[PDB]
Amino acid sequence: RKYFVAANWKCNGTLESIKSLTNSFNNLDFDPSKLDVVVFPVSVHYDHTRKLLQSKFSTGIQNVSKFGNGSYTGEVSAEIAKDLNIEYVIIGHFQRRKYFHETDEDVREKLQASLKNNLKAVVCFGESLEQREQNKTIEVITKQVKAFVDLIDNFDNVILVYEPLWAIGTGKTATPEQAQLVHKEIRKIVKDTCGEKQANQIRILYGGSVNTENCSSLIQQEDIDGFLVGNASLKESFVDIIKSAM
Template identity: 45%
Template sequence: MAMLSTSLSGPKSATSYCAPEFSGLRRLCPNSNNVNSNFHSQAFLRFCSPRKPLKSVVAMAGTGTFFVGGNWKCNGTRESIAKLVSDLNSAKLESDVDVVVAPPFVYIDQVKSSLTGRIEIAAQNSWVSKGGAFTGEISVEQLKDTGCKWVILGHSERRHVIGEENQFIGKKAAYALGQGLGVIACIGELLEEREAGKTFDVCYQQLKAFADAVPSWDNIVIAYEPVWAIGTGVVATPVQAQEVHVAVRDWLKTNVSAEVASKTRIIYGGSVNGGNCAELAKQEDIDGFLVGGASLKGPEFATIVNSVTTKKVAA
C-alpha cells in the first residue's frame, strides 16, 4: 500500500515504509516507540486506504451534512454588510449544505432581518453563564432573542489574544448547548506547537475540555483551525488537514463514542478561499469549512459553500 507523504520539508526516507518526519505531528510509523504510535498508525492507515465510492452520495467519513460557516469577525459597516447580505441572498447555493454566518454583535439584527432564511445566524462569542453584571459580554439568552442559532467558541483569537483557557471555553460550550444554541467548537495549534511536534497533543487537550463539560455532542461542530494558517494566507495542504481530521475523529471514537465520532462534523478553517476549497473538500474527513476573510465576499463564499459538489461520487 502506498503511503502518502505529509512532510512540510524533509525528504522521504528510502528505507522506511512509514511516513516521513512531519513538522508538528508525531511520526506515524508502526514501529515507533511513542506510546500512542499504534493509534496514530491506525488513523493514518485509515486515511490512506482507498474508499469504495457509493453511487449518488457525498463521500464523507462522517454522516452529517456538509457545513460551512462564515466568521465576519470585527469587520463591516451597515453599508458593506447590506451589500454582502444582498450578494448572499442572490447566490445560488447547493441544497445539501448547512450554511451559517457570524456577523459582529452590533449587526446581528440587521443581518437577521434582511438575510435569506436559507442561511442561519451565529454569534462570534457568548458569556459563560446567564447574563448580569458582566460589562461588555453578551449572554446566550440575548443571542437567542436576536435569532441566533449557533455560537463560535474557542476561536484562536479568543484563546491567544483574549486569553481564554480550555476549561473556561468548555464551560461556555456547555452553557450554550444547555440553552439550545449549537456550538462551533474551535481547536488548533500554534506554529511553535506544530514545530515542536505537539499538534495532536494540543488538539486533544482542547477536545478533552469540551468533552469534560458538554452534556451532549448532538449540536456541536468541531472546527480544526491551525493558528498558523488563520488570516496568514498560508493554508494547510489537503493532506495535512485530513491527517488531523482523521486523528480528531478517532479521538472522539476512543474517548466519547463511535456514534459521536460518526455524527460530529469536523470542518477546516485557515485561509480557506475559492481557489483552494475544492481540493480540501475532497478529503473524506473534512466535513466543511469555517471561513474568515473570504466570507466577506459573497460570490467567493458561495463558491466555498458549493465545493460540496467535489465530494459527490458515483459508481
C-alpha cells in the same frame, strides 16, 4: 455527514457593505436541508444581517459569555442569545485565546452555557508553530478537545473547527493532505470519548486559510466536513465556496 460552510466576518462590516453582501449571497439558490450555511456577523450587526439574509441562511454570533445574566458588563449571555433565537455561537476562536486570555476552561464553560440554552456551538482549537515543530500536535489537540468534548449532548448541534495556527500568519501553508490527517485524528478522539456513532456524526471543519481556489481540495477530503471561512467570506465570491459543498 451534512456539509457545513460558515462565514466568520470577524471584526468587519458596515451597514452598507452588509446590505450589498447579503444581497449577492441571497442570489445563490441552495437547499438548507442539503447543507448548513451559517453567517456570523459582529454582535451589533446581528439584527441587520438576520433581516437581510433569506431564511435559508443560518446565523450566529462570534462569541458568548460563560456567565449567565447579571453583573457582567460587556458580556452577552447564552440566555440572551436564546431569547433572540440566535441559533449558533463560535467558541474558542484562536483570536479570543490569543488576545483575550480565553482558556480551555473558558471554552468548557461557554459550551455548557450554550447547550443549557439550546444554542448550537462551533468550537475552535489548534496547535501553534512552536507546538507542531516540537511534535506536540496530538498532545495539544487531545488536551483542547478533551477540555469540552464530553459535554456534547447532540452531535448535529456541536461542530468542531481545526485551526492550524502553525499555518496562519507564519509563512507556512497547510496542505489538504495534512489537514485531512489532523481531522482524522480529531474524529478518533471524539470516538474514544463519545462513541463511534457520535464520531461519525460530528462535523469537523477546517479553520485555516480557505478561498475559492483551495476550497474543493479541502472539502473533498474524507474527514473535512466544511470550513469556518474568514476573509474570503467578506467577498461576493463566497458563494463559490458554498458551491463546493453543494
